Recover the amino acids of this structure.
C-alpha cells in the first residue's frame, strides 16, 4: 500500500500518486540541521528537526497538478506530483453488487470478503459470467507515458478467461484479453474519467491440482523512457474463488423429475402431481448445482451445464447437520469404499475422491460398501424429511427388521404365504439356516456403517429408522438384494415412492414412515434388469440450499 | 468409538469388547412391558420400562470371561462378552515419548497432538525413524478366530514404509510390512499380553500432490466363520505428519563452513576462527534441515541427507518476525520473480514454488528480481544480526547511497581517484549521465522490493540499512553489479565477510554495520568468474531454530 518518493535539492522530481495508497516522503537520503515543508491545498502532509507521509485530496486535471516544497537548513527541494484514481472493483461483498481490506485474500464466512466465479459448461451468456470494473480518473495527457496491464499468473491462466465489453454490455469472441495463452494484456485506456467493464469466467472446477482461487491483477507501468524497461508504479488485484459443485439431498424440495415399462409411469405421474412438481419423459449421473450471488445453475456430472464404485450411484449426501460443534449447512457427501485395502477389494478412483474434497463445502465421508455386489451406498441407506428432531430420518436396510416380521407371521399362522407371485414359502425362508447366516453377516456390515453415520453425522438412535430388507449372497460371497430394496426409494417431499417388495412387508414400512407425515405409494416395477445391470427408475432435480456456500467455514 | 450389540432371548450371543470403546446394548429389536439387567462385576452397566451402555473393567483371561443377562417381562437373554485391550500407540504428544482425542486428526500448535515422520534420504538407521507400538492384552485362545491387519491407504502407500522389529530393536530389510506395493499386512500376534514395535519412515516430502499426512490403521477381523468374509470388529489409527524442509537465515548461529584462489582462504580461516566454527575445504545448493522430537538432521537440496531463476541462489529466508498479528517463528522464504508475466520475462518453475508452499512453516514471498541479469534475490538483499529492535537488520543494495559517497569525494577534492586498480575515474563515473539513468532505474526496482519487504515482513524504515552499491546494464537491458556487491556478504554471527569493492567505500559500509556490533573483514576475491557464470565464495550450515515447527499454526 506504500510507495517511497526520494526528493533532491539539485533537481525537482516528478511522481505519480494513486488515490488510496499511502505515499511516503524520503528526505534524509539527499540532505543540514532542521527541515520545514509547505505543500499545496490538494496535498495533505503529516509528520521539524533532522517520517513524512502524503495524502491526496482528489485526482489531477493535468500533469504536475500538485506540488510539494522541502526546505532544509536554506536550500529548497521541489516535487511535482500527479494524483490519479485507479480502482479495480468487483463483487467482493458477495451481495451481487460491485464495490471498490484485505483485497488480496479470499475469506470464508459472513464477515468475510472475496468474489465468486462460475464454471462455464451475447447478453444471454453474460448473465452467467462475473463482472469486475476498472475506474480511472487521470489527467488528459496521462497515458502518453503510462500504460496499464491486466494479467493472471501462468498457473491460473488456463483456469480463467476474461472478456472486454466492446459496445455497452455486449461482446464478441475476439474481445478476449486473458486466457490459456494470454497471461497478460495491455489495456487501451484514455485520459480523464473512464470506466471499462470486464466479464470473467472459470474454465475448471476446484480439484487436487487447483484449490479454486484465481487472482486477477492490474499494473501501472511508467513508460517515460524508451531506453529503460517498463517500471511498475502501482499494482492492484482482486481474488476470485471458483464456486464448487454442490450435491442436494432428498430433504431438499424437488423441482423436476426425469424417468425412463407401462404401469410404472402411471404411479410416477400420480406421485409427481401429488407433490406438485414437473415431470419430463425422454441413473448413472448426479444432478448438483453451482451457486453465485447473481445466478445459480444446475450442473449434471456423468460420463443446465455438464470399477463398479466409480459410478455416481455410490454418491449420496446427507441433510444439514451439526457434528460436535462443527456445522455442515450443506450436509456431507457420502460414498462407499472398503474397510481395508487388499488385492481383491475395490475403491473409488482417487481422482474422484479428491475432487469431492476440493469442493470443501460438503466434507465427504468414506463408508463401507465393498460387501455389496454392486457396491453403491444407496443400496442400504437413504434420507427422508421429518417434522421433528433434526428435521430428517436416516433409513437403513435391516435384515433383522424383516426377519422379525416373518417370524411373527409363523406366530400368527401365516407361515404358508409365498412370495415372487420360482416362488418360495416364508416358512422355508425362516427355516433356511443358510440364509439366516448370510443376513446375519449383512446385518453386521450395515451395523458398522450405522455407527459410522452416528459418528461422522453426529446422529442418535432416535434419528435412524430400520427398513425391513433381506439380502442374499451373489458370487464371490458378495451381497445382493433378496427382493427389491425399499430403502432405495423415491423421495418427493412428503410423498414417497417405495419399491414394491412383493402385503405384510408394505404394511410395516408404512407404520414406520406415515407417523413422519409421509405418503407411501408403492411401484410395481421400480427396478428393471438390463441384459447384466440393474438400472434405477427415476432421477430428481431439487432446489439448491438457501444457505450460501461461501458463508460456510470449512 | 461405538459398537452395537444385539442380543436375543432365543440364543446367547458372543461379542468382543475392545477396552477404551463405548459399547451400546440393543434390546428392543428382539423383545413385553419392562426390562431388568444384571451383569458381572467386571462389567459396568449404566442406563426399567420398555439406551444401555457397557463398560469393561479389565481385559479377559479366557473367552466368554464376562457375562450379561437381559430379563424382560419373564424371559432372559444371555450375552457372553470378551474384553480385550488393543492400542496402537505413537508419539502423539510430540515430546519424544510414546503415549496411547482426537486420534484421527493431526493438529498444529502447542495444545495440539499428532506424530511426526522424517524423510529418508541396523540400529544406526533406527535412530532416525519414528516409533509406534501396539499393545494387545487378550485371552490365550483369542487369535484362533481373530486376526489383526496393519494398513495404509493406496494413495499414501508410496509415501511411507513400516518395519517390524524381529529381534529386540534390530531389523532386516525383509521385515517390511507396509510399503509402495503392500497396502496392508496381516499381523501375527499371540494371545495373552504382548507388545510389538514398528519403525516408520517417510519416502517423500510434502508437495502439491502430497499435503504431508500419512495415516496408519490397525484393524481387528473376526474369522470365526470360514464361509463368510472377514468382519471388522474394531479399527484404530494414528496420523503421521511428514516433517517439512526448513531453511535457516543468516541470523541463526553458524556451525560448519564450506569453501572452494589463495589469499581468499586465509581471510576466511581468520573469520571462521574469530567466530569459532568449523571450516572444511573440499553455491548451487541450499542447506536446510528437518526436525523431529527425537532427531534433527541437516538436508541439502540441489541438482546429512539430500531457467536462471530455478537455482537456489534465488532462495533466501528472513529472520523470525511478526506481521500484522500473524507470527512467523521460522521466518519467511524469499525468492525472485517478475512483476507481471510476459513472453520475454522468466519465473521460477511452478513445481519449485509449490514445493516451498507445501512446507507451510515458512510462507514464501514473491519478490521482483527479473531485472537482474542473474535474477537471484541475494544480489540486492541480505540480513544481519542486531542487538536492538527486532534483532536483525535488512541490508539492501543502494545506488543512491553509493552516488552520495562519490559526489562528496568531488566535494572533498578526491575526484581524481581511480578504481579497478580497464580503470575508470570517479569524476567520470559521476559525470556519466548514462550511468546515472541506469542506477536510477535500478534504484526504482529495489525500492519496489523495499516496500514489498516492509509489507510482507512487517518492517519499518528503522529495520533497513542501505548498503552503497552500483549497478550497470548488461545485454537485454538487464542489471548487473558494477563492482563486487557488498550486500551478498558472508554472515558468521557478529563477524562479517564483506566482499572488497576496490578505501572510501569500505569506510562507509563499516560505519553502517559496526554500530550493530559487527566485525567487518573484507575479502580480495569473494566472487570468481568461471568461463560464463559467477560463482559464490562459500556456504554455511547454521543451527536449526529453537522453535519447534509443529507448534506453529500456519
Ligand atoms: C443389483 O442389486 C440391486 C440394486 C438395487 C439398487 O438399489 N440399485 C441398483 C444398482 C445401482 O443403481 C444403485 N444405485 C441402486 C436394487 C435392487 N433390486 C434388486 C432386486 C432383487 C430382486 C429379486 C426379485 C425380483 N426383483 C428383484 N430386484 C429388483 C429387480 C431388478 C430385479 N436388486 C438385485 C437390486
Ligand atoms: C553475475 O553478477 C554478479 C552476481 C553476484 C552475486 O551476488 N551472485 C552471483 C550469482 C549468484 O551466485 C548469486 N546467488 C550471487 C556478485 C557479483 N559480483 C560481480 C562483479 C562485478 C565486478 C566488476 C569488476 C570486478 N569484479 C566484479 N564482480 C565480482 C567478480 C566476479 C567478477 N558480479 C557481476 C556479480
Ligand atoms: Ca454459459
Ligand atoms: Ca446417486
Ligand atoms: Ca537414515
Ligand atoms: Ca542461497
Amino acid at each position: 500500500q506504500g510507495t517511497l518518493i526520494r526528493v533532491t535539492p539539485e533537481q525537482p522530481t516528478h511522481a505519480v500518486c494513486v488515490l488510496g495508497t499511502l505515499t511516503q516522503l524520503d528526505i534524509c537520503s539527499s540532505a543540514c540541521t532542521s527541515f520545514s515543508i509547505n505543500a499545496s491545498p490538494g496535498v495533505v502532509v503529516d509528520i521539524w528537526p533532522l517520517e513524512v507521509t502524503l495524502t491526496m485530496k482528489v485526482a489531477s486535471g493535468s500533469t504536475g497538478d500538485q506540488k510539494v516544497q522541502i526546505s532544509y537548513y536554506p536550500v529548497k527541494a521541489l516535487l511535482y506530483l500527479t494524483g490519479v484514481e485507479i480502482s479495480l472493483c468487483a463483487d467482493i461483498t458477495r451481495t451481487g453488487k460491485v464495490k471498490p481490506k484485505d483485497q488480496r485474500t479470499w475469506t470464508w464466512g459472513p464477515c468475510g470478503q472475496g468474489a465468486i466465479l462460475l464454471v462455464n459448461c451475447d447478453s444471454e451468456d453474460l448473465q452467467d459470467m462475473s463482472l469486475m470494473t476498472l475506474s480511472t480518473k487521470t489527467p488528459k495527457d496521462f497515458f502518453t507515458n503510462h500504460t496499464l496491464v491486466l494479467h493472471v499468473a501462468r498457473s491460473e491462466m488456463d483456469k480463467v478467461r476474461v472478456f472486454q465489453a466492446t459496445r455497452g454490455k455486449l461482446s464478441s469472441k475476439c474481445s478476449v484479453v486473458l486466457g490459456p495463452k494470454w497471461p497478460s494484456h495491455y489495456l487501451m485506456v484514455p485520459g480523464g474519467k473512464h470506466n471499462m467493464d470486464f466479464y470473467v469466467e472459470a474454465l475448471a472446477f476446484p480439484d487436487t491440482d487447483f484449490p479454486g482461487l484465481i487472482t486477477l491483477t492490474i499494473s501501472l507501468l511508467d513508460t517515460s523512457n524508451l531506453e529503460l524497461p517498463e517500471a511498475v508504479v502501482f499494482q492492484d488485484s482482486v481474488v476470485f474463488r471458483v464456486a464448487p459443485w454442490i450435491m442436494t439431498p432428498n430433504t431438499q424440495p424437488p423441482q423436476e423429475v426425469y424417468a425412463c415399462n407401462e404401469d410404472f409411469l402411471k404411479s410416477v405421474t400420480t406421485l409427481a402431481m401429488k407433490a406438485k412438481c414437473k415431470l419430463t419423459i425422454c441413473d448413472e449421473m448426479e444432478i448438483g448445482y453451482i451457486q453465485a450471488p447473481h445466478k445459480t445453475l444446475p450442473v449434471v456430472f456423468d460420463s443446465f451445464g455438464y470399477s463398479g464404485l466409480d459410478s455416481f450411484g455410490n454418491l449420496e449426501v446427507s441433510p444439514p447437520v451439526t457434528v460436535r460443534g462443527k456445522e455442515y449447512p450443506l450436509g456431507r457427501i457420502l460414498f462407499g469404499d472398503s474397510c481395508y485395502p487388499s488385492n481383491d477389494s475395490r475403491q473409488m478412483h482417487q481422482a474422484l475422491q479428491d475432487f469431492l474434497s476440493a469442493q470443501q463445502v460438503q466434507a465427504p465421508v468414506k463408508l463401507y460398501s465393498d460387501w455389496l455386489s454392486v457396491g453403491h451406498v444407496d443400496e442400504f441407506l437413504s434420507f427422508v424429511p421429518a417434522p421433528d428432531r433434526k428435521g430428517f430420518r436416516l433409513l437403513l436396510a435391516s435384515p433383522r427388521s424383516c426377519y422379525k416380521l416373518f417370524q411373527e407371521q409363523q406366530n400368527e399362522g401365516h407361515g404358508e404365504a409365498l412370495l415372487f407371485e420360482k416362488q418360495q414359502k416364508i416358512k422355508n425362508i425362516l427355516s433356511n439356516k443358510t440364509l439366516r447366516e448370510h443376513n446375519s453377516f449383512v446385518e453386521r456390515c450395515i451395523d458398522w456403517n450405522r455407527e459410522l453415520l452416528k459418528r461422522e453425522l453426529g446422529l442418535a438412535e432416535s434419528d435412524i429408522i430400520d427398513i425391513p430388507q433381506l439380502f442374499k449372497l451373489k458370487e464371490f460371497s458378495k451381497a445382493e438384494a433378496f427382493f427389491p430394496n425399499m430403502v432405495n426409494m423415491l423421495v418427493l417431499g412428503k410423498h414417497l415412492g417405495i419399491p414394491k417388495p412383493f402385503c405384510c412387508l408394505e404394511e410395516k414400512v408404512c407404520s414406520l414412515l406415515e407417523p413422519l407425515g409421509l405418503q407411501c405409494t408403492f411401484i410395481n416395477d421400480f427396478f428393471t434388469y438390463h441384459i447384466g445391470e440393474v438400472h434405477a427408475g427415476t432421477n430428481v432435480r431439487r432446489k439448491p440450499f438457501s444457505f450460501k456456500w461461501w458463508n460456510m467455514v470449512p
Observations:
- The radius of gyration of chain B is 33 Å.
- The pocket of calcium ion (ligand 4) is lined by residues A 286, 312-313, 315-316, 378 (CB under 6 Å).
- The CA atoms of residues 144 and 353 of chain B lie 53 Å apart.
- Chain B has three domains: 1-89, 90-242, 243-554.
